[PDB]
Design a protein around this ligand. Structure first.
Ligand code: HEM
Length: 291
C-alpha cells in the first residue's frame, strides 16, 4: 500500500507543541520510574519499535498505522517493557484524543530525545490509524545476540546504510537492558537519561570482557558497571563500523546532526507526504519556552 500523510483536521504546529509540552511535563513529573531514570529512554525505544517493523519491500509495518495498540504487536516478545511507555502516553492521548496513535508514539520519542538534551528532531504529522489486520507479525525487530553482518543486513530492510545504523545505535546511551525483559542486564553508560555520544566513547574507552549474565546469555561487561550487547560490540569488530564509531566519539555535533536525520527518517519510513503537506515541525523544549 501507499500511506499518504493526512493532517489531523484543522491542526497546526501550535496544537502539536501542546502535545509535546504535555509529554515533556509528564517526563519531568514522573521522575521515579525505573530507579529514577525516568520515562525518556523507554519512550525513545517505543518510537523506534513502532517504526522498526517497516519492510521497504512491501511497505508493511512502520509508524504510520499506530498498530502497537493491538495485542499481537504489544505482546511481541521483542516489545517486552514498552507497555510502560504506552501507559505513560495514555493520559496524553486522553487529553488530546485528536492525535493519531502513530503520531503520538513517534512524537513521544522526539520529545524524549529533545528533553534529554539531545538534538532537535524535525517531526511531521499525519500518520493515520489503520485496522487490526494491518498489524505486522512479530519477529521484525532485531536480535541482540548476532554480529556485524547480521546488523548490516537487518537494517537494509529499513533502508539504512552503515552511517545511519551507527548513528541510530547511539541511542543506547539511554536507559538500560533489564534481564526479565530481554535477557540482558545493565546500562551502557552512566548518563542514562541525558542524550550524549557516550555510547561511542564507552565502546572505545572501556575495557570489555565477554561474560554470561544470569539469563545464560553472553554480553560484554566493563568494571565500570556498563554493558554492551553483542550487536553493539559488533560496531567495533567490523572495520567499517569502527571508523564511524570513532568519528562520533570525537564529534558530538556530527553525531547529533546524523542521529537527528536518521531518527526522523526511521519515524517517516513508509509515509508519503503530499507536496503541499506542512513543513516538518521543530518543537521548542520546555526549557526554551521557560516552562
Ligand atoms: C541491532 C539493533 C538493536 C538491537 C539488537 C537492540 C536491542 C535492545 C535491547 C535488547 C534492549 C534492552 C531492552 C530491555 O531489556 O529493557 C534495548 C534497549 C533500548 N534500545 Fe535498542 N536495540 C537496537 C537498536 C536500537 C535503536 C535503533 C534505537 C533507537 C534509535 C534503540 C533504542 C533503545 C533504547 C532507548 C533502549 C533503552 C530502553 C529502556 O531503558 O527501557 N535501540 N535495545
Amino acid at each position: 500500500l501507499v500511506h499518504v500523510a493526512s493532517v489531523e483536521k484543522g491542526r497546526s504546529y501550535e496544537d502539536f507543541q501542546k502535545v509535546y509540552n504535555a509529554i515533556a511535563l509528564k517526563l519531568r513529573e514522573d521522575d521515579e520510574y525505573d530507579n529514577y531514570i525516568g520515562y525518556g529512554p523507554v519512550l525513545v525505544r517505543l518510537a523506534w519499535h513502532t517504526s522498526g517493523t517497516w519492510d521497504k519491500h512491501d511497505n508493511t509495518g512502520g509508524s504510520y498505522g499506530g498498530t502497537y495498540r493491538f495485542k499481537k504487536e504489544f505482546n511481541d516478545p521483542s516489545n517486552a517493557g514498552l507497555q510502560n511507555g504506552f501507559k505513560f502516553l495514555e493520559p496524553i492521548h486522553k487529553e488530546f484524543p485528536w492525535i493519531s496513535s502513530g503520531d503520538l508514539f513517534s512524537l513521544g520519542g522526539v520529545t524524549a530525545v529533545q528533553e534529554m538534551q539531545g538534538p532537535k528532531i524535525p517531526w511531521r504529522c499525519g500518520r493515520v490509524d489503520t485496522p487490526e489486520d494491518t498489524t505486522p507479525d512479530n519477529g521484525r525487530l532485531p536480535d541482540a545476540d548476532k554480529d556485524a553482518d547480521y546488523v548490516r543486513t537487518f537494517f537494509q530492510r529499513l533502508n539504512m546504510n552503515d552511517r545511519e545504523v551507527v548513528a541510530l545505535m547511539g541511542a543506547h546511551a539511554l536507559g538500560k537492558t533489564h534481564l526479565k525483559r530481554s535477557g540482558y542486564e545493565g546500562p551502557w553508560g552512566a548518563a542514562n537519561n541525558v542524550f550524549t555520544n557516550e555510547f561511542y566513547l564507552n565502546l572505545l574507552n572501556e575495557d570489555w570482557k565477554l561474560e554470561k549474565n544470569d539469563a545464560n546469555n553472553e554480553q560484554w561487561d566493563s568494571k565500570s558497571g556498563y554493558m554492551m550487547l553483542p550487536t553493539x560490540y559488533s560496531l567495533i569488530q567490523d572495520p567499517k563500523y569502527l571508523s564511524i564509531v570513532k568519528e562520533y566519539a570525537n564529534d558530538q555535533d556530527k553525531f547529533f546532526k546524523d542521529f537527528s536525520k536518521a531518527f526522523e527518517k526511521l519515524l517517516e519510513n513508509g509515509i508519503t507526504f503530499p507536496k503541499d503537506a506542512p513543513s516538518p515541525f521543530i518543537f521548542k523544549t520546555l526549557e526554551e519556552q521557560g516552562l
